[PDB]
Amino acid sequence: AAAYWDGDYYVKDDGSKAQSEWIFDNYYKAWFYINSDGRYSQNEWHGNYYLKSGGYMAQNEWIYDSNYKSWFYLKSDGAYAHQEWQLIGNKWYYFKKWGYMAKSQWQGSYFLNGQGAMIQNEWLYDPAYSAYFYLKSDGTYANQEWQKVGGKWYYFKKWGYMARNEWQGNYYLTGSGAMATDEVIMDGARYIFAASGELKEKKDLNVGWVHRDGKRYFFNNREEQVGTEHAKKIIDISEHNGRINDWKKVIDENEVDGVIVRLGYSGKEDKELAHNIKELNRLGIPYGVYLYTYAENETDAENDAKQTIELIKKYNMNLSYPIYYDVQNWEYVNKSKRAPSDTDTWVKIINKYMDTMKQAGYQNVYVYSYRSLLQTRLKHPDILKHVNWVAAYTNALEWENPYYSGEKGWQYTSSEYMKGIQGRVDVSVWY
């Protein structure tokens, strides 16, 4: 009867065109903003309000704005939510200054996931703080308190840091954070815990590298001698240990018989390789080397072998210990690729590496891996025949390999501290 749309323009009750003003259209039951040129706004903002395609003011709804690359939420009056929480579709969301939805980030004691929702009853590893946090049922981080999560007990310190490798009263939180319910061997002692977690007893032990009756032996955490008086202490080092300031100190003070040096991984040289080889050669310290593989197939394996050979000659390496193909359940950082799961593919990968190295004149070449992989994915006679260095950070290795006989190593720890090295060190007993 009265006001009406004329293309981009709006003719009001008085017969004049709208200009620089909001109008409410009863037919559409929506608000529209008319600009100074008399045309309605659309697919754009006006102050605190967003005008959708066709001009309709957004209200009680999400809008994704591709210019800002952000979600926004327009409230009951159309105004964007900002510096405030909103319960939407039965989930809590936080809006920052200027209305940008919070995502993958903290808001005080709450954490918003990648879709903006406040998380509840979830673990969060936050690399920004380098620790685990647990967001409770109410969304707040567990703090100075116990929480039972998935059948196990965890303790959270001040500021919510998950306790690990440490005591909280009568309870010990293990490396996973889980409360000990069994036994823990540490500090040269065995700690015995009730099923409910409380410490019951501590029994002194004399395990590890021990000098007894004029000779040196290695005892596992079951107090069993591993090897003979000639058992050797071998560390393995990489750029991850940083630059070693004084190698001679490391060797003498820790009684280290030899070193396995990381070459790098498929396609990349280790940052400390050059320095490590230089020093180990200069001091006549016995060493071997290892390459962490990201191989998927035989081509990758032959390339791994070529890289290995290239580095050996480049640095004039004098190899007292073997060349090691370090085989693990690898996965790219960006998760774009992961190791082949089938045994037969690894049989081909491993044997191509071996054959290539052998053809190049290197006969002292073996596989390193961890016990569980060797019991599963790598359990094949043509793989196991090459395996003589095995990782298991356990009380005993208790693993048999009928396919290899001779000198071998057990990497029993990745958490040893040694004089002259910053941080934790991998150590093996060679027997």
Ligand X SMILES: C[N+](C)(C)CCO
Residues that bind ligand X (CB under 6 A): 5, 22, 28, 31, 40, 45, 49, 54-55, 57, 62, 68, 71-72, 77-78, 80, 85, 92, 98-99, 101, 106, 108-110, 115-116, 118, 123, 129, 132-133, 138-139, 141, 159-160, 162, 176-177, 266-267, 294, 332-333
Nearer to ligand X, 72 or 412 (CB): 72
Spatial CA neighbour of 311 closest among 285, 327, 289: 289
Spatial CA neighbour of 177 closest among 154, 160, 198, 158: 154
Report CA-CA distances (Å) from 63 to 81, 161, 220, 363, 386: 11, 36, 62, 65, 59
CB of 99 to ligand X, least distance (A): 4
Nearer to ligand X, 89 or 406 (CB): 89
Terminal C-alpha separation, the chain = 99
Nearer to ligand X, 248 or 306 (CB): 306
Residue nearest to ligand X (CB): 45
Integer Cα distance of 41 and 39 in angstroms: 7
Residue 106 in 3-state DSSP? Answer: strand
The token pair at 152 is 């196990």
CB of 150 to ligand X, least distance (A): 8
Nearer to ligand X, 58 or 418 (CB): 58
Helix H or strand E encompassing 251: helix 247-254
Helix H or strand E encompassing 274: helix 273-283
Integer Cα distance of 152 and 380 in angstroms: 35
Spatial CA neighbour of 260 closest among 419, 423, 410: 410
CB of 386 to ligand X, least distance (A): 23
Nearer to ligand X, 31 or 430 (CB): 31
CB of 146 to ligand X, least distance (A): 14
Nearer to ligand X, 109 or 343 (CB): 109
CB of 393 to ligand X, least distance (A): 14
CB of 113 to ligand X, least distance (A): 10
Q: Which amino acid is at 301?
A: A
